[PDB]
Every structure is written in structure tokens, then in C-alpha cells.
Design a binder for this molecule. Sequence first.
Ligand SMILES: Nc1ncnc2c1ncn2[C@@H]1O[C@H](COP(=O)(O)OP(=O)(O)OP(=O)(O)O)[C@@H](O)[C@H]1O
Ligand SMILES: Nc1ncnc2c1ncn2[C@@H]1O[C@H](COP(=O)(O)OP(=O)(O)OP(=O)(O)O)[C@@H](O)[C@H]1O
Ligand SMILES: Nc1ncnc2c1ncn2[C@@H]1O[C@H](COP(=O)(O)OP(=O)(O)OP(=O)(O)O)[C@@H](O)[C@H]1O
Ligand SMILES: [Mg+2]
Ligand SMILES: [Mg+2]
Ligand SMILES: [Mg+2]
Ligand SMILES: [Mg+2]
Ligand SMILES: [Mg+2]
Ligand SMILES: [Mg+2]
Lengths: 177, 177, 177
Amino acid sequence: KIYTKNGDKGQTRIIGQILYKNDPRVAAYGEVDELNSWVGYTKSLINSHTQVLSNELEEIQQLLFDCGHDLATPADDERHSFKFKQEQPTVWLEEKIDNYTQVVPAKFILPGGTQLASALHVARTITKRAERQIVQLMREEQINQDVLIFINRLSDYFFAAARYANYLEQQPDMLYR
Amino acid sequence: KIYTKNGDKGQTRIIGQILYKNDPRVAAYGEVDELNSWVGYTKSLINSHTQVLSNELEEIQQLLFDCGHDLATPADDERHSFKFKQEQPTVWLEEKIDNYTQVVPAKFILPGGTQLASALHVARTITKRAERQIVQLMREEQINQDVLIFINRLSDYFFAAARYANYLEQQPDMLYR
Amino acid sequence: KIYTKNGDKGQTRIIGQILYKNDPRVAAYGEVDELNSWVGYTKSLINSHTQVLSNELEEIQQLLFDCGHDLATPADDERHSFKFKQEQPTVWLEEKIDNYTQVVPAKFILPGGTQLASALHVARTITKRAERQIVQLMREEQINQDVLIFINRLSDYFFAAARYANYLEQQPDMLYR
Ligand SMILES: Nc1ncnc2c1ncn2[C@@H]1O[C@H](COP(=O)(O)OP(=O)(O)OP(=O)(O)O)[C@@H](O)[C@H]1O
Ligand SMILES: Nc1ncnc2c1ncn2[C@@H]1O[C@H](COP(=O)(O)OP(=O)(O)OP(=O)(O)O)[C@@H](O)[C@H]1O
Ligand SMILES: Nc1ncnc2c1ncn2[C@@H]1O[C@H](COP(=O)(O)OP(=O)(O)OP(=O)(O)O)[C@@H](O)[C@H]1O
Ligand SMILES: [Mg+2]
Ligand SMILES: [Mg+2]
Ligand SMILES: [Mg+2]
Ligand SMILES: [Mg+2]
Ligand SMILES: [Mg+2]
Ligand SMILES: [Mg+2]
């Protein structure tokens, strides 16, 4: 049974230590879970016009699992150790950003356009929400700061990705009048 | 007029007592509202392949209204009384979990796949978000603990439901590499 | 480069002043961003049956940019000044509410129905979430109270809009049994 009932009183285990479910840690690992499921949702909207975006989103979902793992791990835990390193993943998001920025037409942009592009804009803001929550934790506990670097860059990726999605289906970006 | 303007100063009534809208109670009843509307959204994605899931999601929406009612009710309120009982509803979610678990192929799963399945994964994480917020309240006030038992089981249902949705449209679950 | 890396340590600038990203202000401007991207998502679901709703949603996105601007502006800032006025925008939402209320069939309604209507119900609850967060800020800092009046009315609009969306595609509202 996937349901243990150990949580019915509002408490839960992390990597290693029973916390309340409103604990800033659980919230951080939790928002990254919501973001990941949203990314999965965004990916399912992919069609024949926007099919190139499929792999990288699948990749980001794997990266996000690692992020949630480390976030669920206390920094002083003797038995359990940070597994996420920001360098390769973040550099990789930076190339896609530069690539998508040069492709698209160079006022402030409002989030919307194609269904996929709008969903990419949604992921941009859910990324930020998870990030605020990761900073709330960082402020009370030691975290893998690598997670924070990557997440920060990730919302930028999403913006870049959104504009590109609009581009792939001949759709102008929504601009603030 | 559905707009009274009584709220324009950031205050609102609950069952019974004027609270601030950022009050942990309002937040709890509020996240359950967001979850319910998300469930409604998920249900609207149902097609001919996934049509069996329609009734139970509609049912969950009724269950969630009862949950939000009790959450909006102070435990010491003389005039107003808890209406949600977890036993029948939660047992019913447990049978669907066991049924969906035995049907599907038995690594950690990443949220995604069909549009409906991904949307079910989204509801799984929104359920948890509302749950964290229900624990935040539980920690300062007396709540219907029955609500918390059900909500906890509900995110488990959603996981089970998501895998099944992927199954109904011949789609393998996304797995952590 | 759209990525400055100035934020990788969890801090960010507002209008004018470096804050933490979990700062109640950033959260307020942030939830309004998420709501706006959600509105954009809702708009992308528009088809031939529901095409009249397109302009007003685009309009709301512009209104929401102004709201986030003012929310990101300290009230005592000498160089920077509130740009959102609730009167015209809010009156305009009130006419659409009265118009949509008279059109639709006059029990409590559960959020769901057509895909667009359900997505409008989602925006109704995301509006409220951003509103709770705007009250959390209002409680510690001076805000443009005009923003709060409009946002409050905006969730009411969304309810009205949702019922209308269901109406435009011959779909009965989901009712609490
Ligand atoms: N409401 C929540 N929000 C975010 N993360 C959670 C929440 N509840 C649990 N988790 C985390 O995700 C993991 C898997 O979730 P699970 O539902 O199994 O937790 P639980 O409530 O403790 O267990 P159970 O549902 O069996 O009682 C948990 O170990 C915990 O770290
Ligand atoms: N921002 C919010 N988030 C979550 N729940 C809310 C919020 N505002 C109100 N509610 C709850 O939902 C009920 C219905 O919402 P409603 O918008 O009518 O509240 P209000 O703001 O007090 O009224 P009005 O919009 O007429 O000024 C309220 O009685 C309150 O309990
Ligand atoms: N996590 C967040 N949630 C909500 N709002 C944010 C967040 N991070 C930044 N903002 C706001 O939106 C603006 C644009 O976002 P941006 O990502 O450029 O911020 P940053 O993290 O400071 O910069 P960078 O990503 O270049 O390091 C910022 O100036 C800030 O006011
Ligand atoms: Mg479980
Ligand atoms: Mg940033
Ligand atoms: Mg109202
Ligand atoms: Mg649980
Ligand atoms: Mg940036
Ligand atoms: Mg209101």
C-alpha cells in the first residue's frame, strides 16, 4: 500500500527526522514537486510544431528530482549527502537561453500566446514561487546553494523557452501597451 | 450583486467572525478551493479513452466542498458544526488506490505522460500544498482532523489515478533515470 | 543576457532597495505574476465558441501588470509613484459581472464544466491566493489600496466569467448536491 497512514496527523519524514508538513523544508521540496508536475503538464501539450522542446523539458524534470532530493536533506546529516551540482545543468540552461534569445524578435512582454508558450510562462512563475520558498528555508537552515543558483536560472530559461514556443507556431508575443 | 465590497479592505467573514484574508484559516479553506477548481480543470480534460474517471472526480469535488466548509468552521462555534466524516470517503479512496495499483506496471516515477495524467499529477501536488496549509492551521487552531486524514489520502489517490490515466491511453510512466 | 546572476544568492531588487525573495512584497508582486500567466493560459484555450472573451482577458493582463508595478513600489519612495487607479478598471469589471449574472441561469456552484470555464475557475482561486498575499503585505507595509479593491473584484469577475463560459458552450454549471 502506497498509503502508510503515518502522515494522517500532519507529520512526515524527510531524508534521514520527523517534521511538520508546514515546515519550511517540506514546503521547499513540495513547491519543487509542484513545479515538476507542472513541467510534466507543459510537456504533454507539445505537438508536431513544438516537438524539439520535448527532450529538454524531460531533462529538467530529472534535474528537478535531484533538486528536491537535496532540499529534503539536512546539510549536517552524516549519512546523507548533497547530490546536485549546478555547473553542468546551469551552463546548459544558459546556452538554451542565449540560443532562444537570438532566434526571437528583439516593450515589456506579457505572458501568453500559444497554449504551450503560456504554459511555459506559468512554469516561469511557479519556478519563482518555489524559489521564494527555497529562500525562506535558506534563511533558517543551510541548503545546497547550487539548487538555488539552478532554480534562479530556470525561471529565466522558461521565459526564453516561452518566447521560442510562440516563435515556433508563428505567434507574436503579448506586449504591455 | 455577487460583489458586496465588504472585502475591499482585506477582511472577510468565515462560517459564524471577521478575519484577515491572510489568516491561516482563510488560506486553508482557500487552497482547498484552488485544489477543487484544479480538480474541475482536470475533469474537463477527460476524453473517450479516460471517461471512467469522470464520476469519481465529480464526487471528489463534492467531498472537497464539505472539507472547505469544516475548515471555515471554528471548532468551538456553538451554532455551527463539523459535517465531514473521513471514514466512508477515505475507505473509498483506498479501494481505488489498491485497484489502480494492481492494474498498472509494478524506479521513482516522474510526474507526466498524457495530458490528463500530468494534470492528475498536478492535483497530487496541489493537494499536498493545501495539506501543508491545513497543518499550519491545525498548529494554531482546532480543526476537523477528519479533513486532514482525507486530504492526506487524496494526494495518494491522485498518484494512483495518474498512473492509471497513463495506463488507459497506452502511455508508459515517466521514470527517474 | 537576460540572466544577471545578481539573484543567485536569493536576493533581488524591487522598484527603487534589495530584498529577500521570500519578502512579503516580492511574494505579492510574484503571485500577481503567476495569476497573470495563468490568465494568459486561460486565454490560449479560447476557441470559436468563446471568442468574445479574448479582448477582456488581454485587457486584464495589462491591468495586472500595473498592479504588480505598484505592489513592487514602496509607498514612501520619493522617485517612484503609484500608477494604478481602481475606478475605471473596477467599474468595468462590475458591468461585465452584472451582464454575465443576468445572462446565466439563476444551490452552491462547484468549479468546472468546459475546459475554458474550469480554467476561469482556476483563475478565480489564484486571484484569491494573490489577494491573501497582498493582504499579508498590506499588514506590514503601506500599499496601493486601489490594487486590493481591483483584485478583490477580479475574483468575482472570474466566477461570473466562468459561468458565462459554461453558458457559451451549452454546459450546465457543476452544482453541490
Ligand atoms: N503535504 C506535503 N507537502 C509536501 N511534501 C510532502 C507532504 N507530505 C509528505 N511530503 C513528502 O513527500 C514524501 C512522500 O509523501 P507521503 O504522502 O508518502 O508522506 P506522508 O504523509 O508522511 O505518508 P502517508 O501519506 O503514507 O501518511 C514524504 O516522505 C514527505 O517527505
Ligand atoms: N482571498 C481569499 N482567499 C480565500 N478565501 C477567501 C478570500 N476572500 C474571501 N474568501 C472566503 O470565501 C467567501 C466568498 O468570497 P467573497 O469574495 O464573497 O469574500 P469577500 O471579499 O469578503 O466579499 P466581497 O468580494 O463581496 O467584498 C468569503 O466569505 C470568505 O470566507
Ligand atoms: N523568485 C521570485 N519571485 C517573485 N518575484 C521575483 C523573484 N525573483 C525576482 N523577482 C522580481 O522580478 C524581477 C525580474 O526577475 P529576475 O529573475 O530578473 O530577478 P533576479 O533573480 O534578481 O535576477 P537574476 O535572475 O538575473 O539573478 C526582479 O527584479 C524581482 O523584482
Ligand atoms: Mg503516502
Ligand atoms: Mg532570478
Ligand atoms: Mg464577492
Ligand atoms: Mg501523505
Ligand atoms: Mg533574470
Ligand atoms: Mg472578495
